[PDB]
Amino acid sequence: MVSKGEELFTGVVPILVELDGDVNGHKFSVSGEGEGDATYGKLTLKFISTTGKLPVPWPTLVTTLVQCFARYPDHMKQHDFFKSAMPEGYVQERTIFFKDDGNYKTRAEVKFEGDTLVNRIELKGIDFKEDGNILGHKLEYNYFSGNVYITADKQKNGIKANFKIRHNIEDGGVQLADHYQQNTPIGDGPVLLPDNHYLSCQSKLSKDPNEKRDHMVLLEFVTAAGITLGMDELYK
């Protein structure tokens, strides 16, 4: 059946994101506006630095700056926890370990305000090297992909997830970021607790040529995968 959460994502939903961040004492704020189309798992957003200059590279904030917009194939629709928690929303907590560097700890509330999907985030980064790849702004600004591996967590009535992101470095190397993640529903109603699966994500980063503030234009595609259910036998 069309469960109640999925009904809110059949069309284009406007998106607001607000992030307060503190990395090694540098405080910043990011405001993002855009839209999501879960039918195609498509995100189009523009983020602006409102406090001033970012102490960290924009690509390291991508994974933090709304997985309820993932496209779950029909045969996987019973494993979409994120939509099933709507409109009351969910709390998403993450720890991002940057290899041989500091770590982010993020707490976000994702919920509907009227017809708008809203993501309010607080981020705290610690133990970062001053001349490292993050604070030294040594990372490339282009594109990256990710496979978010999701398992259920019925004790907290939510989900857990892990993944690895490999950010290209300007010299040619790789900055590794290990994400560990937990999501818990905000309401007390029933939610879909999924079998193991993953989200294939692709993120393209660009710049508005007319924008003079520190900003990031992001185009994202997120598709659930990892469950066949026997869709191969249908065609002999």
From Swiss-Prot:
Coiled coil: none
Protein modification: Contains a chromophore consisting of modified amino acid residues. Maturation of the chromophore requires nothing other than molecular oxygen.
Practical uses of the protein: Green fluorescent protein has been engineered to produce a vast number of variously colored mutants, fusion proteins, and biosensors. Further generation of mutants led to more stable proteins (at 37 degrees Celsius for example) with brighter fluorescence and longer fluorescence lifetimes.
Superkingdom of the source species: Eukaryota
Documented effect of changing residue 169 to L: In R10-3; matures to the red-emitting state with excitation and emission maxima at 555 and 585 nm, respectively
Membrane in keyword set: no
Consequence of substituting residue 143 to C: In mut1.9; shifts fluorescence lifetime from 3.03 to 2.74 ns
Tissues with expression: Photocytes.
Outcome when changing residue 67 to M: In Citrinine; leads to excitation and emission peaks of 516 and 529 nm, respectively
Effect ascribed to mutating residue 196 to I: In mut2.1; shifts fluorescence lifetime from 3.03 to 2.50 ns
Record annotation: effect of changing residue 200 to F: In H9; increases fluorescence at 395 nm excitation
InterPro entries hit by this protein: GFP, GFP-related, Green_fluorescent_prot
Effect in UniProt of substituting residue 66 to L: In EYFP; leads to yellow fluorescence, folds faster and more efficiently at 37 degrees Celsius and has superior solubility and brightness
Effect of residue 196 to S: In EBFP1.2; shifts the excitation and emission spectra to shorter wavelengths and increases quantum yields compared to BFP
GO biological process: bioluminescence; generation of precursor metabolites and energy
Spans through the membrane: none
Phenotype for residue 222 to R: In Azurite; shifts the excitation and emission spectra to shorter wavelengths and increases quantum yields compared to BFP
Gene3D superfamilies linked: Green fluorescent protein (2.40.155.10)
Effect of residue 97 to S: In alphaGFP/cycle 3 GFP; improves folding at 37 degrees Celsius, reduces aggregation at high concentrations, and increases the diffusibility of the protein inside cells
Effect in UniProt of substituting residue 67 to L: In RSGFP4; increases fluorescence and shifts the major exitation peak to 489-490 nm
Keywords: Chromophore, Luminescence, Photoprotein
Family from the record: Belongs to the GFP family.
Function: Energy-transfer acceptor. Its role is to transduce the blue chemiluminescence of the protein aequorin into green fluorescent light by energy transfer. Fluoresces in vivo upon receiving energy from the Ca(2+)-activated photoprotein aequorin.
Subunit structure: Monomer.
Name of this protein: Green fluorescent protein
Annotated organism of origin: Aequorea victoria (Water jellyfish)
Gene label: GFP
